[PDB]
Every structure is written in structure tokens, then in C-alpha cells.
Amino acid sequence: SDEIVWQIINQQFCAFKLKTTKGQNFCRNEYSVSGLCNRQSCPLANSRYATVRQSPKGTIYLYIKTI
Amino acid sequence: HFRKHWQRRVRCHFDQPGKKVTRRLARRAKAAALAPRPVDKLRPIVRCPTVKYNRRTRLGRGFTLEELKAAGIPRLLAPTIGIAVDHRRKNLSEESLAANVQRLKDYKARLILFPRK
Amino acid sequence: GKVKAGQLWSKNKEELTKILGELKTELSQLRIQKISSSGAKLNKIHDLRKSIARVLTVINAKQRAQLRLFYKNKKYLPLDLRPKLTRALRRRLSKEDASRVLEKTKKRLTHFPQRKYAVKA
Amino acid sequence: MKVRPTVSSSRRKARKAHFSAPSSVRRVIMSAPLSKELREKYNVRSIPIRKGDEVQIVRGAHKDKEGKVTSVYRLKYVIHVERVTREKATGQTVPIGIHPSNVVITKLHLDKDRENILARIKAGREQVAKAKGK
Amino acid sequence: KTHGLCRRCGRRSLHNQKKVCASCGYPAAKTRKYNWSEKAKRRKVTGTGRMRYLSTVPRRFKNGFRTGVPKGAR
Amino acid sequence: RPTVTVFGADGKPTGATEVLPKVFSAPIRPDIVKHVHTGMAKNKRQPYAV
RNA sequence: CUAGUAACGGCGAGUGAAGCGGCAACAGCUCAAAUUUGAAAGCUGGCUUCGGCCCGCGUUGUAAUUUGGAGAGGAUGCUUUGGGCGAGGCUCCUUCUGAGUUCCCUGGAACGGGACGCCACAGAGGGUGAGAGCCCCGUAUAGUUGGAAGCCAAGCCUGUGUA
RNA sequence: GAGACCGAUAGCGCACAAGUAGAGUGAUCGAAAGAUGAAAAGCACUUUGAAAAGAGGGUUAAAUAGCACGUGAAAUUGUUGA
RNA sequence: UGAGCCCGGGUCGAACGGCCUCUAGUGCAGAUCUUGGUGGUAGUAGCAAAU
RNA sequence: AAACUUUCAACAACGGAUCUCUUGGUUCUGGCAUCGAUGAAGAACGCAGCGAAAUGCGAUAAGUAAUGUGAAUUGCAGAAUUCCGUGAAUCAUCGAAUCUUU
Ligand SMILES: [Zn+2]
Ligand SMILES: [Zn+2]
């Protein structure tokens, strides 16, 4: 149901979506590897996902999500 | 069909749920007044008049005097113990008599009559 | 000048009349002399007017109580001593008259009253 | 949330009832909390304020000022504390209107009816304490 | 003048020759009232005046149209 | 997935599980939901008129 | 709902029901036409010491009995009752009932921001010097204080007359 | 008791003196008009002069919030500069 | 491209905005349009009803 | 040259739009049934220290009595009027009264 949740997110409503008038949409989700709303970068509509985030200590981690 | 002044005679029904609440509270008031009694009276089974509805039956107005006498319920006691009486209806056949007599003895089998004092 | 109400309730008719007379005379004199240099006379005039109102109320109440004591067993009372209600409430049937029934109805209700019963499920 | 059908959550009706209230209702509205020591002593949280109470102002530009209430102006919904005053242009010292919700009563003007009020409030609070305990 | 003062409505609409008020019809017992003028009916309706007695009826209804005095009254 | 774990009052699982109903495998149709919600949100409306 | 059907109409404009069926609510009765005729047994007033006394109405008919899916009269043998107090209860007004004005900053004013808490069957609403659950009024829930009028009522007194 | 209503040219004619002021012989017709500030603390006093007016000075967080009072558009107008 | 939108500077003093849907009393240059305000004519004609 | 006319900017006017507000309207829903010859609805005249409006009241006249609450009213002026009290109040309730001319 990756495709169905993608259709619901992309075509109806997503709380992490920033719609700009300049030709690009942005993803407000913290686990998005690129802050852009597209099919490949969605942390929710992709069951297997991976991102890179930096802690307040300065240590950088890789986050992996499985189905 | 708007030839007449229909503007002055439009009836809306925004008070439908409020009237349903009013009807339910009226039934509750009837229950409060008649506390162990049912809020309804017992009514007979009658056949629908026309040939179109002859196959089905419905509830009548009140039991015939012959039906009450055959069931063993006196005429004057019957309205005071929850049974409706209709003096206009006639039986005309041995099959409505038996059905409503069975209904009356079934009502008698499940009745808790209290003494006067 | 200022008189409380219960003290007036204790006294009788001729007494209440003589305080009424002296209060009226004081009010008349103060109204005559109040046209020049009205200082603290205004509050006293207002208090005296309220005092006359209180005395008149007490005498009226005592007189109407005595009149009601007179008419305790008499059939007709004066219209001032009758309850007002409304015009329609004064014209409706009395409780004794409206609750009256015929003898046939009374016999039927006596021997065949509405009974208490319960249909068990 | 209100449940009783007689209560109204209308802002319009509430504002009209507040600003067009009688003098006794205004007395009830113009109430002040008791001090900590008086709250443990009488088991009463707040009382309607009256002339002769000694209060401390806990809000506004006149914070931490104490004094005796010399006027309860119900029409203007304000009390006048002693020595918490102002100066006009001419130099007259006018009182400063302080809301009774901004003060804390440190000393009550104890009469018989005030003791009856305190007793009734204490009885209700202790009977609810009994209901909570068991 | 054509019209003089009327006793019933207090307006200067009583015809000086016919002796009949043009606003209320004073010699007639019934006050003049017509359904083709709602404005005229609302200028003299029950509620546009002082209500000396009709304003006291609801409070008397609220307590059941009772008589007497409370117990312990003086 | 056939079962869903049950959690205690402390937030930790009790060890018991429940069978997931069929209604969680129903089709997810945002168009039907949009239609019925648009209709149903209008049903508590009080009339207004001049 | 029947039903824009039947029916009617410069048969054009059109006008336009009802029975049945489903439901809401249900409740039945009073007289006139009889002779009480072994007893006007009925009623409005006035006087009252309030208990019973007078005048009048009325026989050209006031009570009782009866009202046609009825009824009366006899016989018959079973089955039914009437009044007066009344504790208390319901309805409605009323009294009372939770918790921060803790510390810092900004600001004329904190009801704003930060920190640490508390109440919640109460985070409806309003006021308070700016967005206040805990400053105030109220709000929620069961109670509780006093009162008003109706109705119901456990019980307690009595019943009576060949009714 | 409420609302997916209207918000002072709107919503009742009337949020305020509203069936009022006012018009008509009369039957009748029928307006316009809300907002200082948290609090009047509503400008003391000195000084021009006859003003519903100024200059100092004061209150206020603020007076370019001064009962012509929240904000203060445009049409239109005056002073200065180009 | 455009209807428009975003930011700076000043004034101001209590609320407001984007996005996805829903809803409508939803967009003005004109109607001898309605209401209010304000002009040239014009400090002109004239001292006329009102003022 | 000066004067006049036009455009632009700053400031000051005129005017009251815009924004924000709202003890108002409007529409819906629920409980209840209560005017008058025992004088109604309506009209008029009066009552307060300063009352112009509005409201309240009727020669007992911004009101009297009774009950309840419990310390005010308030724009200014006045009270030797009341604060462990049958008791303030432009208070609330309200069963007793007064209630001018129509
Ligand atoms: Zn996305
Ligand atoms: Zn007239």
C-alpha cells in the first residue's frame, strides 16, 4: 500500500507539505533526506527508507527504516 | 404548479428532531404515570379490507364483545386492565374469532393483576 | 422625624393618627419655611414624606385587617377585600363545581375503577 | 463543557449580564481571595469584599501596597484602598480604582453575618472533603 | 381649523365638523384599526405605552396568583 | 498481519494479542470519504434568512 | 405514499381529490322519546348561634333508572363498595462545594515568553490594566440548607342503610 | 437556548433621544446619528486676548489619543522645495 | 505574460496568515445608478424665501 | 525680471473609507399559557436639590409595606442615617397597600 498512501499524500493532503509559488514543493518531515515533496523522497510513502541526521552533540547518524 | 402565492404557505421541518424528542418525552411521561403498566393498550388482529391487501393482517381498533366473552374477559373489566374494546366490529367468521380469542388468552397468560387495595 | 415600621406596628389607631397629624403639621411648616435657605431641610422633608407614607400604610393595613375580621363568615365581601386574580380566573368554574360528576358515572367509577397491572416479558 | 440547558455560553448574554447587573449581583462579582493564613484558618478561599477590610494589592503598578478598603464602588466595579491615591492637575488627591480581583484580603471586617458566611463556606468545603475521603 | 384635539389618542385629528377622529374614531367604542397599514397598527399597539397593569400580570402568574402573607411576617 | 498486541496500563505489552478484524483490510477510498464527509458536514446546519 | 391518479375543463391555459396501505395519538360518553306515582325523592336564594330553618322555582316535569351493536321488569346466585386525616415522595426556586497570583525576562499593566507545579464528572462562557482551567464570577457532579403550590401516597381513624 | 447569518451605507425603519426629531388639514410618511484612554489621570499654573482661539507648562506608555477624541484612504485645499 | 504576490521604510495598536477541502449576499468605469463627501463655474450673478 | 498655469515630493488641512471591535439585529429550536366594568390597551398631567432626556411611580408620587441578602448610594451637594444590626442599598424577591384626569 505504498502507492495508495502516496496517492493520498500527494493528491489530497499531507501535513508535512510546504507548497511554494516558485515551482517546487518542500517536505517539512525531519526524516526526509531531501526536503522536497516527490515520490522517491517521501519518508511516509516509502516503506524502506534511509536518511542522515546530525545530533545536537555533533555526531552524525544514518537512519534506516524497513517494512 | 406555482400559480398561487405558495411563498406564504411553505412549511419547513427544521423541528423534526425536536419533535421526535418531544414525542419520546411524552412517552416517558406516559411511562411515569402508568408505572408497571404498558404505555399501549392491547389491540386485535384484523384482515386488511381490499383484495390487494387481503393476504396480510394488521392491528385493529378493539376486541369484539363476542371475542371478549369467549376469552373469559368481562366487558366492563376489559378497558380497565389494558384491553381495547370496539363495539362496531363484528366477527362474521369463525377464523377471526379464534385468532383474536387466542390473542386474548395469550394476553391473559402473561398478565400480573394487582388487587384493588 | 424618621420612624421605623415595627414601632408603628405596635401602636393602635388613635396613636397612629396623632403621629400622622404631627408629621403632617411638621411637613407643612417646613414646606412653608423651606423656600428660603434650603440646606439640610431637604433630607428631612424627604424623610418626613417617607414617614407619612409608612404611617398611612400601617393604618390602612390595620383597618383592612379589622374589616377582614368582620367579614369572616359573611357570604359577600366588598370588592376591595376580594382577591384580584384575573378576570378569566374569576369567571371559571369552581373546584367543587368542575369536579362534580353524575351518579351513573360515580357508580361506574366506584365499581369498575382503573386497575394496576403488568404484562411480563 | 456546560451540560445544564439553563446555562448559556453566549458571549453577548454574558457581557450584558455582567455590565447590567444589580447591586447584590455586583457584590457577589466583586469578590477577593483570602490570604494564605486566613485560608488555613477559616478554610475559606474567597469572600465578597466590603468596606473595612485590610488588603494587599498583588497586581498592577501599585503592587505590594497594603491598606484598608475605604470605598466599594460597585457601579465602576472597583475598590478604593487607603493611601493608594493619585494627583490631579490641580493637586487634589483622588483615589485610584483597583479591581477586587487584584487584591488579597489580609484582615477581615469580622461581624456576625461575615462569620455566618465563613461558617457556611467552611461547612461546604469540609463536607466535600468528607465525600472525597470516603 | 379642520381638525382639533382628540380625547382618546391625544392627536389633532378630530374633525371639527363631523366630530369624528380620523386617527382612532373617538365616538365609536372600537379604536380604528386596519390591516392594510401595519405601520399604523404598530404605532398604537399594546407595548407602545406605559403598561400600568399589564406589566404586573406575569410576576403574579409566576407565583400561582397567590394571596396572603409569608409566615412570620409583621 | 493476523494479530495485534495488547498493551497494559503501564504501556508495556501484557502478552495477550487480538485478531485484527476484516474491516482493517477494507479498501481505502479517499473519493468516497470526501463525498460522504462533504455531505455529512452539512447536516448540523441551522438555517439563516433575512 | 396514494398522485399529478380518478374526475372536471375556450378538453387550451389547466384545475385537481378520496378509499385502501405504513405511522403519530388514541377514550369514550350525555340527553329526548317511560308513571317515582307506596309518597318532587330535585334545585336557586335569604336568615343564621353554622346545626337547620323560611320564601321561591318546578307537575306545561326538577332527581334517580335508560341511550338501539342497546335497555327495562321479575326471578336467581355469585361477585363488588363509602367518607376523613395523613408521615413521606415528585416538580420548581434557593444556601454551599477543585486547583499557582511560585521564580525570571519584556511591558504603563502579564492575561505574553521561559522554568517548576496543581485541579479536572469542572479545558462552556464572561470579567480582571494584552491570549487566565488554578485572581474573581460562574462551569461539572452528586449531595445539602430553607421555602411555595399542586398532585401522588405507606399507613391511621371511621363506616350501615334490609343502601 | 442556539447558528458555516449581518457587522454601523450591513443587520429590523430604529446597536445611540427611534416610531424619536421632522413633514402633512388629515389618513399617513419618517430619518441621520456607535468607538478618548487601562484608569479622567478630561490639561493645574504663567501669559496673549472677548475666540467652539493661542504660546509656554503639565497628565499619560503615547496628547501628530484633548470629550472636533482608536486607525485615519481618495476626491478637494494650503505652506515649502524643484 | 497577466489578474496578482513577496520584502524594505514610516504610521499604528490586537489580532492575523499559508496549504488541502467545504461554502457564498465573492471581484465594477458606466446603469440621466443609490448614499455620503468634495470641486470649476465663483468670491461670479445678486442683497431676492431661508440664513 | 516678477505674476499665473501644470507635474512631483515633504508637512499641514478637508472628509470619514479601510482594519479591529459590538449590552444590536436576524433566522432556527425548546418549555409554558397569563389583559379588561375588582376598570384593560392607549392618551394626558404631575412626583427629584441641581432633571436637560430616558426610566420608575401616583397627592403614601425616582415610591410605602412584607421577605431575603448583608454594608452601601455615588456626577456634584447633604445627613448626628446605618455597622455584633428587625439592618444601608438608584439591591433583589414580592403574597400587603396607595393608585390624579381620561
Ligand atoms: Zn510529501
Ligand atoms: Zn382619536
mmCIF file of C-alpha atoms and ligand atoms in Angstrom, chain E residues 5-11 13-14 20-26, ligand 2:
data_model
loop_
_atom_site.group_PDB
_atom_site.id
_atom_site.type_symbol
_atom_site.label_atom_id
_atom_site.label_comp_id
_atom_site.label_asym_id
_atom_site.label_seq_id
_atom_site.Cartn_x
_atom_site.Cartn_y
_atom_site.Cartn_z
ATOM 1 C CA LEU E 5 -57.641 67.727 19.696
ATOM 2 C CA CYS E 6 -58.993 64.236 20.390
ATOM 3 C CA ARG E 7 -59.519 62.909 23.905
ATOM 4 C CA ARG E 8 -58.663 59.272 23.171
ATOM 5 C CA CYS E 9 -55.421 59.383 21.167
ATOM 6 C CA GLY E 10 -54.395 62.947 22.016
ATOM 7 C CA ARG E 11 -53.798 63.924 18.383
ATOM 8 C CA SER E 13 -57.087 64.736 14.088
ATOM 9 C CA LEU E 14 -60.650 65.075 15.419
ATOM 10 C CA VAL E 20 -65.155 62.074 14.458
ATOM 11 C CA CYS E 21 -61.459 61.386 14.973
ATOM 12 C CA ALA E 22 -59.543 60.474 11.827
ATOM 13 C CA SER E 23 -56.912 58.509 13.775
ATOM 14 C CA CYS E 24 -58.967 56.454 16.247
ATOM 15 C CA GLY E 25 -62.655 57.278 15.707
ATOM 16 C CA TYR E 26 -63.371 58.637 19.180
HETATM 17 ZN ZN ZN K 2 -58.726 59.986 18.352
#
